């Protein structure tokens, strides 16, 4: 909806859900990252903040983005569809690559990634400290925001587990492997375990706990397919 | 540098007393689920007790009925077990553990004899 | 309510052999909260595996945890001779947590 509106309309501390997230691994130092959405325009830097406040909860939204560099005028080295997904207390970035640059002036490659995750990190010491919580959100990837993603947390035994269901590709419909809550460099708590496809493994998935009641979970999997890694990101929240 | 050092137990008579105590090291005790396994003489495992991180909420199971409490120090990183009452089936190596059910790191074992 | 049997109670073999040992629940469970211990001589109890698959952080790759439903599979493969242990199952979805009575595993010779 307001995508125009959060490319324009300050920050506003009474918008809904998470209302900025600081752009950090999607824009580096050099860089200037420019997205552009009915009409609207911004150009953000490395550390400025995005106002996700302005956008609906619980879905994928889309802006074209231009990675540029300024050597006389701009260099594009990259452009697609840049995607946000926002949660109350969480949100993520994505990069679908759509065109790259050659020496010789656009080639035309397909790449997609993730870039943020942020949020109010749950700190690990003030974790529930009890009960089983369930967590049911989404799963999404290049050219697919349908999938389903449900996990579970047992917080005194300080693990998790779950499961990526309905992807267009087989090979993605994964479980996530029972894997511990550890502590952050930023004593934030994160889990980081094993993909598993039918009982085998094939690659790594990471999810951190967020808000101040641990209501989301928000993080990233990679996961190895007969055509090689592809990158889900990940994102769900209670009951 | 994650350890569980225990001490306390010995050698007590039927319907006497002691204490166990379990000291961390290494990690952030208050974060966490604390608990006491306990091994008779050539058996196995069987879980007596545990506390939650504000260490207000304690379970025991069910051959324990009140003889033994659980306590915890979040500032001295230490937790206890009071024993009273003791019986001679209570005669066993005696294990604190990390985490509620998923025992994760254990103390090094403790041993508590009843006999006459 | 539930008892954890675990068969064969002990077992003999060789160094470089692959050992297979069972977890029997007597109702079926949530393999997300199912765990091995190892228990070597003398010394305190081991978390090998849990969530029946997941290796605790220094259990080497050697260890494989399977199953489901009511059986679950402890697969030792090469065997090196710290291995010669006792091993215990148990399913910590809630108290008292139970454990099996353990499987020993010593040396063939």
């Known amino acids: 909806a307001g995508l125009a509106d959060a490319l324009t309309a300050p920050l506003d501390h009474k918008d809904k859900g998470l209302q900025s997230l600081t752009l950090d691994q999607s824009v580096r130092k050099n860089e200037k990252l420019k997205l552009a959405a009915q009409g609207a325009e911004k150009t953000y830097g490395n550390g400025d903040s995005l106002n996700t406040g302005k956008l609906k909860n619980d879905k994928v939204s889309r802006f074209d983005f231009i990675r540029q560099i300024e050597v006389g005028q701009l260099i594009t080295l990259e452009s697609g569809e840049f995607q946000v997904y926002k949660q109350s207390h969480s949100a993520l970035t994505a990069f679908q690559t759509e065109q790259i640059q050659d020496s010789e002036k656009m080639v035309a490659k397909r790449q997609f990634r993730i870039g943020d995750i942020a949020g109010e990190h749950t700190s690990f010491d003030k974790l529930p400290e009890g009960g089983r919580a369930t967590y049911r959100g989404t799963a999404f990837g290049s050219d697919d925001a349908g999938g389903k993603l449900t996990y579970t947390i047992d917080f005194a035994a300080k693990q998790g587990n779950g499961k990526i269901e309905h992807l267009k590709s087989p090979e993605l419909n994964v479980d996530l492997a029972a894997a511990d809550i550890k502590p952050d460099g930023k004593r934030h708590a994160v889990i980081s375990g094993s993909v598993l496809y039918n009982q085998a493994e094939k690659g790594s998935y990471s999810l951190g706990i967020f808000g101040g009641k641990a209501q989301e979970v928000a993080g990233s999997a990679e996961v190895k397919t007969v055509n090689g890694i592809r990158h889900i990101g990940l994102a769900a929240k209670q009951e | 540098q994650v350890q569980l050092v225990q001490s306390g137990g010995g050698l007590v008579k039927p319907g006497g007393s002691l204490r166990l105590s379990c000291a961390a090291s290494?990690?952030?005790?208050?974060?966490?689920?604390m608990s006491w396994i306990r091994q008779a003489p050539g058996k196995g495992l069987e879980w007596v007790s545990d506390?939650?991180?504000?260490?207000?909420?304690?379970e025991y199971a069910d051959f324990v009925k009140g003889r033994l409490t659980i306590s915890r120090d979040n500032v001295k990183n230490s937790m206890y077990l009071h024993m009273n009452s003791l019986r001679v089936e209570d005669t066993a190596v005696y294990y604190c553990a990390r985490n509620r059910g998923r025992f994760d790191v254990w103390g090094q074992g403790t041993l508590v004899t009843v006999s006459a | 309510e539930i008892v954890m049997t675990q068969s064969p109670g002990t077992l003999s073999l060789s160094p470089g052999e692959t050992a297979t040992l069972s977890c029997r629940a007597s109702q079926m469970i949530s393999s997300p909260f199912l765990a091995w211990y190892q228990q070597r001589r003398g010394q305190a109890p081991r978390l090998l595996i849990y969530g029946a698959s997941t290796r605790a952080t220094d259990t080497p790759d050697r260890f494989r945890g399977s199953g489901s439903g009511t059986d679950f599979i402890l697969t030792i493969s090469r065997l090196e001779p710290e291995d010669f242990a006792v091993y215990y199952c148990?399913?910590?979805?809630?108290?008292?947590?139970?454990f099996g009575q353990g499987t020993k595993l010593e040396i063939k010779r």
């Open positions: 148990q399913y910590y979805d809630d108290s008292p947590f139970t």
């Open positions: 290494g990690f952030p005790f208050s974060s966490y689920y």
């Open positions: 506390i939650n991180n504000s260490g207000n909420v304690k």
